[PDB]
DNA sequence: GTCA
């Protein structure tokens, strides 16, 4: 997910992280894009486990619903009593959870904002466009270290702030923004490169564009990024950059509570017994796993 | 370089 390909230009500032060094950390987790995929009572458990295998403390968060810029943008690329067995699953284990007002993404970088929890475990970019600035990705590949991104080695390494990549999502498209037709991770990093921001950029692209001369003399660089926009037919309007998609990032919904959250140890028998009531379980099969943690 |  998120700005598509933002993860290639933010990629370099990673730092790989050991899942032992995440100990007793308080972690925000998107729940509602897991259920977007995983069968659901399975995968909820087999990555629950291994988050409470290394000790993390995570607080599950949900979609309170999917604002209108963002139905139209996913349906143009192309039961909720599931909701209910994991946050069962999930009160089982002892593991907190809320439902936020819209956006679980935009909700998760408040709990870190507002220190209630110290990172957000999440793939979804967008995260960053929404503020969050403590991300561990790659959470549930399989391997020992996760990778560690923030706001500030983004800021520092590579010269982009929020503003800077809510404008790179207009260009490489996501959740809220198709992008543009032609533009990838390395156009577009240089056109923030070349220009500074997106309306330096519109109007560099409307000036030229039917002005014979200043064709002729342009950069390398230019000549090629004129030719791809005009072989893709682009119009740069005053709708360009877009103020909503700005809106709905910079100030989206969002649930100020202030109070800490608790966590409890899990329970092992309500646990065995969940299994076997749903997914035709053994208690061996539940303890053996559970009961090392 | 950008997409199956």
Not at 36 to 61: A, D, E, M, N, W
Not at 267 to 277: A, I, N, P, V
Request: negative net charge; aromatic residues 12%.
């Amino acid at each position: 997910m998120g700005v598509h390909s933002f993860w290639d230009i933010a990629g370099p500032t990673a730092r790989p992280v050991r899942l032992e060094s995440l100990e007793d950390k308080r972690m925000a987790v998107d729940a509602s894009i897991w259920i977007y995929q995983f069968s659901h009572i399975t995968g909820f458990f087999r990555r629950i486990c291994k988050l409470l295998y290394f000790g993390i403390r995570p607080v599950f968060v949900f979609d309170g619903g999917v604002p209108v810029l963002k139905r139209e943008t996913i349906r143009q690329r192309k039961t909720m009593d599931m909701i209910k067995e994991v946050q069962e699953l999930l009160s089982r284990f002892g593991i907190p959870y809320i439902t936020a007002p819209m956006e679980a993404e935009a909700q998760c970088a408040e709990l870190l904002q507002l220190n209630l929890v110290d990172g957000i475990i999440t793939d979804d970019s967008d995260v960053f466009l929404f503020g969050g600035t403590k991300i561990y990705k790659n959470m549930f590949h399989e391997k020992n270290y996760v990778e560690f991104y923030d706001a500030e080695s983004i800021l520092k390494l590579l010269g982009l702030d929020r503003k800077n990549m809510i404008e790179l999502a207009q260009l490489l498209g996501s959740d809220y923004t198709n992008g543009l037709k032609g533009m990838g991770p390395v156009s577009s990093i240089e056109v923030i490169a070349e220009f500074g921001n997106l309306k330096n950029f519109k109007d560099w692209y409307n000036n030229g564009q039917f002005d014979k001369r200043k064709q002729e003399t342009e950069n390398k660089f230019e000549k090629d990024l004129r030719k791809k926009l005009v072989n893709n037919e682009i119009i740069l309007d005053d709708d360009f950059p877009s103020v909503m998609v700005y809106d709905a990032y910079m100030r989206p919904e969002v649930d100020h509570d202030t109070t800490p959250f608790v966590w409890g140890v899990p329970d092992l028998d309500m646990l065995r017994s969940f299994m076997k009531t749903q997914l035709g379980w053994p208690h061996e099969k539940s303890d053996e796993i559970l009961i090392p943690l």
